[PDB]
Amino acid sequence: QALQKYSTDLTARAREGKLDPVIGRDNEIRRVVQVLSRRTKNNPVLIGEPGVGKTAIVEGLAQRIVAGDVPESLRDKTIVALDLGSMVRGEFEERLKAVLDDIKNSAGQIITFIDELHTIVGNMIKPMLARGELRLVGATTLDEYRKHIEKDAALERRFQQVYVGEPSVEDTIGILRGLKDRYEVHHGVRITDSALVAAATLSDRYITARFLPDKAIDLVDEAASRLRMEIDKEEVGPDDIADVVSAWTGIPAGRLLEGETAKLLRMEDELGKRVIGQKAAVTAVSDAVRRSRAGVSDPNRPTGAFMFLGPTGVGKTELAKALADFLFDDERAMVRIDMSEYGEKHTVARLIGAPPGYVGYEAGGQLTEAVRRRPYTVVLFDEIEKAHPDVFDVLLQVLDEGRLTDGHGRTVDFRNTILILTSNLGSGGSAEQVLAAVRATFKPEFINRLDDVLIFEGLNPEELVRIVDIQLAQLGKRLAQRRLQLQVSLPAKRWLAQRGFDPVYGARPLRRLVQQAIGDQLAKMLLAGQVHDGDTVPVNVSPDADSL
Amino acid sequence: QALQKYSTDLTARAREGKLDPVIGRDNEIRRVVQVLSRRTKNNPVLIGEPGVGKTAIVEGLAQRIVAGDVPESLRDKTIVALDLGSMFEERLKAVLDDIKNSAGQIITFIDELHTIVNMIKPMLARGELRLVGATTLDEYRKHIEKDAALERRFQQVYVGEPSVEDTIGILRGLKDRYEVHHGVRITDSALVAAATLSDRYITARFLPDKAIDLVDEAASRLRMEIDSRPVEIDEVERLVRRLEIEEMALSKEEDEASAERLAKLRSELADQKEKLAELTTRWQNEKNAKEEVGPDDIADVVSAWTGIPAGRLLEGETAKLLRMEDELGKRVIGQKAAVTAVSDAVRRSRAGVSDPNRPTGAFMFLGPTGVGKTELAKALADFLFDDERAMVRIDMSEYGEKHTVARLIGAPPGYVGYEAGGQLTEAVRRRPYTVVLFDEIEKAHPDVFDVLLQVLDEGRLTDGHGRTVDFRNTILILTSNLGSGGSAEQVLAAVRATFKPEFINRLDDVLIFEGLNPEELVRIVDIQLAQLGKRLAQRRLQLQVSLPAKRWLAQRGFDPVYGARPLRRLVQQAIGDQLAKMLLAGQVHDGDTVPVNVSPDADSL
C-alpha cells in the first residue's frame, strides 16, 4: 500500500464493476482455482496466443472472488497486476526488489499477476518463490514459454501450464452478443445478429493475422463508429461490415459473398480473359474443377490431375498462370519443375532429400518443400515424357492418396492442389497417332487415374489477332509515364505474324520482337522530338522493316 | 488553467485565424475523428516520415474543429498540445492535474512522443486523456511495437506524402513568404517543375518538404548570382586566374622534364581564356536587350544534389549517349550483341522511359574466361564517373558461408562489430549512383541470393539497425563462368538449375559472351601497346613497333581456351624482359626511343 505505483488493483475496481462480465470460458477458472490450492507447484501461468482472453479469465476470477463462489481457502484475497513496461541499463532490479519487499511485508497470500513474464525470465526471485509468501499468475505464448522458460529456466518445477486455445465462431458469437448493449449506448444505432455473424465469419475467413475475441470486436466497433460519423441508413448490417473488411484488405466488397456458385459460374471467359482460344480446353478444365468441388469424391486426392499436350508456346503454361489467379488469388502460386534433370535412377530422390545428415537435407526436396508451405499451389511438369520411369511411383503415390513424407519426417498433404503435366508430344499426330503414342509411352494404368487428357489445338492463323491484340493493349500501358499514345495499323500488326510466329517456339519471341523494335527504335525520337502525349506516333511498314 | 504558460493553444489561434495552409488530408482527418469516436483502441498515432504533413494534419483538424463539423461528443474539444519546448518530475504533476480534473475537453497532442515512452501509462489505463501521437514507423517499431501493455490504446494512422496537384498549392501558400527575403520571382513554371521533377530523381527525402527546399535553395542561388558576376562567369575567371599563376612559376624552372608540363599548362590556359571571352561578350547582349526563377535552376539544384543527373537535355551530354556504343568500343572489343544491350538500357533511364521501381539496370553476362566480362563493367564505370576507382566491387567468393550474410548487412545491435556498419549497404546509403559488381556470383552461398531477390523489383533492403537504403538508381552486374565449354544449352541448363527461376525472373536480358577471334586480336594488341607506352612514359622512353611485329604478336598468342591474358603474358615476357635487361645495364637512358623488329623467332629490340 506504500509503493502502489508500479501495479494496479483488480478486486477494488471490481467493487465498482469497471470490468466486463466474462461469460464463456468457465472451465479455465476451475482449472486455475484448483491449481492455486495445492501445496507445491501451485501459482499457475496462462499460455496462449495474444488476444484470446487470458486477462479476461483473471478478471472473471477476481469477479467470482468479490461475489463469493470459491472455497474459503481462496476467499478473502486481493489480486494485483504488474506492468513490466513501467520499469524499463539497470535499476529494473532495484525497483523489482523494492516491490518484492512490499509483497513480502503483505504477510499473507495477496496474489499478484504478471503479464508477459518472459521479460523477467530470474535467479533473483526463486528464493522468494520457494518459501511460501507470494502467488503469481502469468501470461505468455507457447513459443515464448519454450524460449524464456525452457532453456535457461530451471524454475519450470514451480509453474503450472494452463491452456487457453481460442474460441470457436459460434462461441465468439455469443461473446459478441453479450458485449453488445455497451456499444449500443456508447455509439448507439442498432445491432443485428446478421451483422454480428457476418463480422465473425468474415474476420475468420479473410483476417488471418489476429485472433477471434478481439479481432471480431475490432471490426464491430470500427464499423459502428464509421456509421456514427456518416451522419455529418439507421441500421448496421452484413454489407455494412463487408465494406469495412474491403477497406481493410483491398479486395472489393462484391466478391466477399458466396464462394461456391459465385465462383463456379465465373469459370467462364474470366479465364479466357488471360487465356485465348482453346475453348474446349477451358470448358473441360472448368468441368473438372466444378464437379471435383461438389463434395462427393474421396476427400484424400488432388483437386485435379489432368494433363495437356500438343504444340509449344500456344499458351500451355498460360492457362495455369491464369487459373492460379482465379482460384488461389495469385499468379505467383504455380511451381514448375522440369522433368529433364530427372532422367537418371538416383536423381528421383532429389525432390524429397532423404536422410538427416547427408548432402541435401536442410535444402529439402524440390516437390515437397515448395508445398508444405503454401499448400495451395499449381504444380507443373515440363516434358514429363522425358522423366525417368521411377518418378511415376512418387506421382501415383501422390494422386492416389493425398499425403507424402519428406526427408525431415514431416507429413505433407496434396488434397487441395492441382497437378498439371505438359508435354511436347504430338509433332505430326493431329488426333490419331498422338493418343496411341501417349498410351504406349506412359504406363497404361497411370492414365486410368488421370482426368481429361485434352489436346491443345494449333493457333488458327487468323487467331493470332487476339493474342497480339492483348499484347498490344498491354504494351499500351508502357509509355503512359509520358502519356504518349500509340498507332495501330492492321497490316503492320499482321506483319508481326508471318515473321514472328515461328511454330517451333510457339509465340515466345513476339514480346522481345516488338518491345525492342518499337522502344529502342523510338529511343532516338523519345529523346530528340517527333513525339508528345497527343501523338499516336504513326508507325507503319517500310517495304523492308518497321520504320515510323 | 495552469497550462496556459507551459503549452501553446490552438483553440484560440484558430479563432484568431492564423494557421499553416492545410489542403487535402480530409479523409485522414475523418479517420482520426472516427477512431476518436470509439470505445477501445481510440486516440490514434500518426505514422510516417519527417516532412509528410502530419503537423499540418493536426493543424487542419484544429481549424475544422473551431469551424464545426463534428459529432455530439466533440463540443469544440479544445484540443491543446503539451509543449516539449517546456523542459523536473515535480512539475509534471502540476501539468497533468489540470487535464486530470477535466472531463476530457482539453485533450493533448504529444508531438514526437516516441521518446516519452510510469506517469502517463497509469493515467492512460483509466482513460482520461487522448494523447494524440505522431512519430515515424521505424522508431514506432523500436519503441512501442513490442510493448503490448500500451498497444491496446494506440491505433496507428498511416499517411502518405504525395499530393502533387496540391503540393503546388502549398508552394503557392508559401510562395509569398519566400519572395520576401530573396528579391526573386518564384514562377509557376518553377512550382510545377519542382513538383514534378525531384520526385522520382531525388529519392532520399520526401516531396512535401523536399519540393520546398528545392525552391528555397534555387531562390538563394539566384539571389547570390544577381550580384554582378553570376555562376559560370565566376568560375572560368577563378580558373584562368589560378592557371596563370601556375604558369608564371614554371618559366623559372631549370628543368627539361617540366618543359612538357609547361608546354601544356600554357595551352589549356590559352583554351580557357577564350571561353571566358565568349561568355563575357555574350553577357552584354543580355545586359542591354537572369532575374527570375525558372525550370533550369531547378535541374541545376537537382544535379548538385546526390550527384544524380536529372535535367531537360543538358546540352553537353547530348552527343555522348548517342555515341555510347561507339565510345565504349575504344576499350572493349567484340560482343556487339552485349554492347547493344548494355547500351540500350542507359538511354532508357536518361530518357525517362524505364520502370521507376527497379534498378536502372540489372542483368548478368557469363561465358568463357579472358573474354572481357570484367573489362566491360570497368569500361562502363570509367566513362560515367571519369575514374575507374568509383565502382563498388564485392567478391562473392568470400561469401561461401551462411553466417557471412551479416558481413554486408552489419551485425545486430549489442554485438561486437556494430558501429562498423555494413559493407554493401554502407556504400550505397551515402552517394547512391554507382555500379555494383558481383564478382563470381556462383561461388556464393545459395542464401545471399535471397537478398538480391529482395533488391529486385522492390528497390531496397534492411540492415542491422533496421533502416532501408534505396537501390533504384544503380546498375547491378553479375559475372560468372558456368559451363565454360558448352555451346548454349549446357550453360543455359546450368544457370537455370543453379539459380531460382524467380530470381532469373526479375533479371533483364541474360548475356552469353562468345570468345575472341584473330580479327579482333590486332585491335587488342594495339590497346596493350598503347597502355604500355603510356606506362613507360614516366621515364620518357617511347617505343616504336613495326607492323610485322604487331602481326607476329597477334598471331603468337591466340589459343581459344584462355582468352586474352596470354597476350599480356607474352607482351611482358617478350618485350619488358629484354628492355629491363638493358635499362639497368645502361645504354637505354632517359629521353630515348628504341625500335623493335621481327627476327626469325624472337623480335630483337
Ligand SMILES: Nc1ncnc2c1ncn2[C@@H]1O[C@H](COP(=O)(O)OP(=O)(O)OP(O)(O)=S)[C@@H](O)[C@H]1O
Ligand atoms: N469470455 C469473455 N468474456 C468477456 N470478454 C471477453 C471474453 N474473452 C475475451 N474477451 C474480450 O476479448 C478482448 C481480448 O482482451 P485480452 O483478454 O486482454 O486479450 P488477451 O488474450 O488477454 O491477450 P492480450 O492481453 O490482449 S496481449 C477483451 O476486450 C476482452 O474483454
Ligand SMILES: Nc1ncnc2c1ncn2[C@@H]1O[C@H](COP(=O)(O)OP(=O)(O)OP(O)(O)=S)[C@@H](O)[C@H]1O
Ligand atoms: N574485348 C576486350 N576488351 C578489352 N579488354 C579485353 C577484352 N578481352 C580481353 N581483354 C583483356 O584481357 C583481360 C581479361 O580481363 P577480364 O575481363 O577480367 O577476363 P574475364 O573475361 O573476366 O575472364 P574471367 O572469368 O573474369 S578470369 C584484361 O586484361 C582485359 O583488359
Ligand SMILES: Nc1ncnc2c1ncn2[C@@H]1O[C@H](COP(=O)(O)OP(=O)(O)O)[C@@H](O)[C@H]1O
Ligand atoms: N491463348 C493465349 N492467351 C494469352 N497468351 C498466350 C496464349 N497462347 C500463347 N500466349 C503467349 O505466348 C507466350 C508463351 O507462353 P508459354 O506457353 O508460357 O511459353 P513457354 O512454353 O515458352 O513456357 C506468352 O507470352 C503467352 O502470353
Ligand SMILES: Nc1ncnc2c1ncn2[C@@H]1O[C@H](COP(=O)(O)OP(=O)(O)O)[C@@H](O)[C@H]1O
Ligand atoms: N498540406 C500542406 N501544404 C502546404 N504546407 C503545409 C501543408 N501541411 C503543412 N504545411 C506546412 O509546412 C510544414 C511542413 O512540415 P510539417 O508538416 O510541420 O512536418 P512535421 O510536423 O511532420 O515535422 C508544416 O509545419 C506547415 O507549416
